[PDB]
């Protein structure tokens with residue numbers, strides 16, 4: 416009988432409130448979730464790029480800096496993979512749910528006042544736009560300073576962090592979106608290309624799309 420070690424966490428109260436607003440409100444332009452996840456990947460890639468200038472050894476865990484987009488119709492998932500700096504277990508805990516960082520509170524209050532979802536990434540909470548289209552999100556991540564971990568949440572006020580012994584990452588972050596039944600358009604090649612073109616043209620790392628036959 417194999418094993419993983421897991422810990423359950425409560426979302427910080429304002430993040431939980433924010434996620435509820437995201438999950439339960441109609442917004443047009445839900446398509447921006449992908450721009451936000453790509454931009455998160457870009458930010459993480461910048462960190463390893465500039466850190467590599469003074470310490471090339473940080474690239475031992477993977478030299479190519481790039482982004483992969485992987486839709487899977489049968490799994491009903493859209494996966495975004497990057498070879499950015501990655502997150503430690505403590506990074507996952509501190510940055511993906513237990514602390515209301517940056518513009519978390521400001522943006523929550525803005526949505527409360529009936530604001531658009533569009534500027535979510537400017538407030539430092541772009542990751543949570545995933546829940547515009549996903550019922551469940553899994554984040555696999557590997558940083559040079561720690562082991563590989565899986566972060567997991569279907570919202571409802573909690574998330575888990577566990578050891579992960581699947582396919583090795585090397586270094587970076589994979590975000591797996593389990594799509595809602597009425598959001599399956601984002602599994603289609605044409606739609607992904609449309610939204611990358613409209614919102615992610617200036618991203619300064621190579622993006623590869625894996626088109627299903």
Ligand SMILES: CCNC(=O)c1cc(-c2c(O)cc(O)cc2Oc2ccc([N+](=O)[O-])cc2)on1
Pocket residue numbers: 452453455456458459460462497499500501502506510511539540541542543587588590
């Ligand atoms: C502390 C050093 N690590 C990072 O900054 C980092 C960030 C990411 C990353 C990613 O590569 C892709 C994503 O979709 C998200 C990522 O991290 C986060 C976590 C939370 C937010 N947020 O909006 O609250 C954004 C990016 O990976 N490593």
